Design a protein around this ligand. Sequence first.
Ligand SMILES: NC(=O)c1cccc2cn(-c3ccc([C@@H]4CCCNC4)cc3)nc12
Ligand SMILES: NC(=O)c1cccc2cn(-c3ccc([C@@H]4CCCNC4)cc3)nc12
Ligand SMILES: NC(=O)c1cccc2cn(-c3ccc([C@@H]4CCCNC4)cc3)nc12
Lengths: 147, 147, 147
Amino acid sequence: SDAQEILSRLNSVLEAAWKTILNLASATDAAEKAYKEGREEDLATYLDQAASYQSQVDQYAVETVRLLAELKKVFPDEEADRALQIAEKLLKTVQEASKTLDTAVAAAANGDEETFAKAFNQFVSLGNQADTLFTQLQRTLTNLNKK
Amino acid sequence: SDAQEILSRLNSVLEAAWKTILNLASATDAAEKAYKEGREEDLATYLDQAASYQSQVDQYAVETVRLLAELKKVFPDEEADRALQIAEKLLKTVQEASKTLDTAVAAAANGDEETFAKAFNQFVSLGNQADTLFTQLQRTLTNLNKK
Amino acid sequence: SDAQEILSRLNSVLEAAWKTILNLASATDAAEKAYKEGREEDLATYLDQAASYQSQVDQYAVETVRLLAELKKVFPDEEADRALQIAEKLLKTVQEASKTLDTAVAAAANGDEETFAKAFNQFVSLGNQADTLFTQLQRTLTNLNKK
Ligand SMILES: NC(=O)c1cccc2cn(-c3ccc([C@@H]4CCCNC4)cc3)nc12
Ligand SMILES: NC(=O)c1cccc2cn(-c3ccc([C@@H]4CCCNC4)cc3)nc12
Ligand SMILES: NC(=O)c1cccc2cn(-c3ccc([C@@H]4CCCNC4)cc3)nc12
């Protein structure tokens, strides 16, 4: 059929996404420290890195939805439907995180610390919510791969 | 450092951004054609290309605001302030275009054509608005490059 | 060298090539539009973009020929022999397309509309020939992959 090839591509996308997520978390740790130390040029560099990693996570989350939508067409069963539902919620959260990080990056560039700090704290909350969904998706794709 | 080094960096940034904008316009034209033709995998490819170019425009728009904020610190008048205000409005519009394109990409991945079409049409309107501001910023910067 | 690793690599190469072909078609659509509208600087940019994708397609065609030759040695059967023959015809055709695109670039640079129009028309014809060959190659590789 096709399910096994799709599942293999999904494994590769999620492994790449996890590395990118680790890089995003590291860049935002560094951004937070630069903000607290008042190092504006360092902050700008780490925010730019974070934005690049966030855009890459956005792409992988879209790819994940598309692959699971294809899986459900070729292997209809509530476990694939469940994985697709989780992936769609993850993508929604990732895009919320992305828009919020964008607001923080613009506020920092505009010299607007109040909006920066509010947006940054919102981003952290959304990133943690996305991590919960990502881990849940990973668990689910073990049913489907048969550990 | 000096107002001249800054203004020359800004010219390089805007030149690069214009090339990226041309590529974004071309990718979105191709997405529209694939959408009209019902070619879903082609549409996915072109939406991903569009999102990548949009991410790059976002980065250049941030860099433009940062450079004009630095120019204003170096020679504080009202011509620098006016350019910065235009660039800040451009960045806001760019980020609105980016969030709206992201919604369209997600809707397409989810097979929700109603949301896709609404978000894609909003993206086009925002893109045209951003083009107006980009051209306005370029005019303003010519009046600053006072040889 | 084993048959399955080579087929795997070929599948990846052809998927990457298809995305690049989509990008080449988009850049050439944009070039045609700029030409029709008299936007000469836009045309120049889009021709440079098209040439970049054309050079990438050329390299994927080279890689495909090399890989199919390897497949014939460790996996002799007349389908791989047919695939190599198609791939070599594709490589000849994409090189001819590259030459014609080069002529279009130089004609635009010289502002020689008569030569430009002839070269661009020839490019479109060669692009359609290459598309037929690429489709045949995809079908032959599907046959080889034996599910
Ligand atoms: N932002 C995302 O799209 C995203 C997707 C999936 C898992 C994610 C995990 N994060 C995440 C990103 C950053 C952080 C914080 C921010 C700074 C403090 N320590 C790390 C915590 C979680 N972001 C994720
Ligand atoms: N989207 C942006 O951030 C952006 C920034 C600056 C100038 C811009 C110009 N555009 C733009 C992008 C796409 C389009 C249309 C929409 C699709 C079909 N024809 C091209 C029109 C304008 N987007 C821009
Ligand atoms: N040029 C190539 O090497 C090539 C290789 C494989 C498949 C291809 C398909 N094309 C192609 C490229 C461009 C076009 C037209 C020409 C411009 C207006 N509409 C798109 C039609 C087909 N080019 C291909």
